């Protein structure tokens, strides 16, 4: 719940440095929790 809320907050803040790497980190943190990554590994 908290992470979904945080990514929504970040998206609405950026849509209108730290921001770029934070967006990349969130995208990475979501590409490792999908069934595709599970089956590939």
């Amino acid at each position: 719940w908290i992470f979904k809320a945080e990514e929504v907050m970040l998206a609405e803040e950026d849509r209108n440095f730290r921001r770029k790497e934070k967006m990349f980190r969130f995208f990475i943190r979501r590409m490792v929790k999908a069934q595709s990554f599970y089956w590939v590994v």
Partner: protein
């Protein structure tokens, strides 16, 4: 009699023609009464069978004794609602069937103290409070989130933000969400005729921000008049008891956490900044949990964000289908 049948037919045709007119406003009752059993209804057998604290939508006008309206129930038809003065009359009829209403008791004392009913035996007295049977509540009940901690701290802000985003996305094009920066807990109706009518009085309330609160009250009223769903993001709500005696009567939504350990673990997961306020966060959490379930309107106790999302979505879908 031909006149009564003629007025019956006229009222029925008027209802049939006005079934498809824009809704004017809405009210809420606080008394137990049925609109079908009365003989003064212009249409017999098609009254409203309501109870205490029910919501009515009024579209057109009938007279000083009755109005036309529908219920917020799903599939509710058009009936007639007794007027404020008519409800006062029927309430006086409620307290007249008894043996006595005034000061002279009937405890085996008849024929000596007639004691004609004075002003104390009528509705003229008892004006110290004078709670009105009818109140003009907003047409659409505002949706407000409370819990699981103080608004303005990370856990609560995100826990509410996620639900706000879900509501905006699922109901896109049919819902309006605005943040209410101003205070809201002082939504009073019977303080005075006009506390602080002008800002140049330089009085205690003229220089205050109460007028902002009232202005936000009419803003919420007119936005609920629009018939579209409204969700409030005011950061001054931490218990429904602070907004239960007002006129808005918003839909209280509770996003509770199963146990205190989970909440404080969650708080620890944020950092030291929330560790500083963890004490007050726990205090408000336990105080809000001690609030009983009947105080709230809906509950969100599921630990999964999705399940709570579809729960709230189903409740609001039921509300939308009920008021159309």
């Amino acid at each position: 009699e031909s006149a009564r049948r003629e007025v019956e037919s006229q009222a029925q045709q008027q209802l049939e023609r006005a079934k498809h007119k824009p809704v004017a406003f809405a009210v809420r009752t606080n008394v137990s009464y049925c609109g079908v059993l009365d003989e003064e209804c212009p249409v017999q057998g098609s009254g409203v069978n309501f109870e205490a604290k029910d919501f009515l939508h009024i579209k057109e006008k009938y007279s000083n004794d009755w109005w036309i309206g529908r219920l917020v129930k799903e599939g509710g038809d058009i009936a007639f609602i007794p007027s404020p003065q008519r409800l006062e009359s029927i309430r006086l009829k409620q307290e007249q069937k008894a043996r006595r209403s005034g000061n002279p008791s009937s405890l085996s004392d008849i024929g000596n103290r007639r004691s004609p009913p004075p002003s104390l035996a009528k509705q003229k007295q008892k004006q110290a409070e004078h709670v009105p049977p009818y109140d003009v509540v907003p047409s659409m009940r505002p949706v407000v989130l409370v819990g699981p901690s103080l608004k303005g701290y990370e856990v609560t802000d995100m826990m509410q933000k996620a639900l706000f985003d879900f509501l905006k996305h699922r109901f896109d094009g049919r819902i309006s969400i605005t943040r209410v920066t101003a205070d809201l807990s002082l939504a009073k109706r019977s303080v005075l005729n006009n506390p602080g009518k002008r800002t140049i009085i330089e009085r205690s309330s003229a220089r205050s921000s109460i007028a902002e609160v009232q202005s936000e009250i009419e803003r919420i009223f007119e936005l609920a008049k629009s018939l579209q769903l409204v969700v409030l993001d005011a950061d001054t709500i931490n218990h429904p008891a602070q907004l239960a005696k007002t006129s808005l009567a918003p839909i209280i939504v509770f996003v509770k956490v199963s146990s205190p350990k989970v909440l404080q673990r969650l708080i620890r997961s944020r950092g030291k900044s929330q560790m500083k306020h963890l004490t007050v966060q726990m205090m408000a959490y336990d105080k809000l949990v001690q609030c009983p379930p009947e105080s709230f309107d809906v509950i969100l106790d599921e630990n999964q964000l999705e399940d709570a999302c579809e729960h709230l979505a189903e409740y609001l879908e039921v509300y939308w289908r009920a008021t159309h």
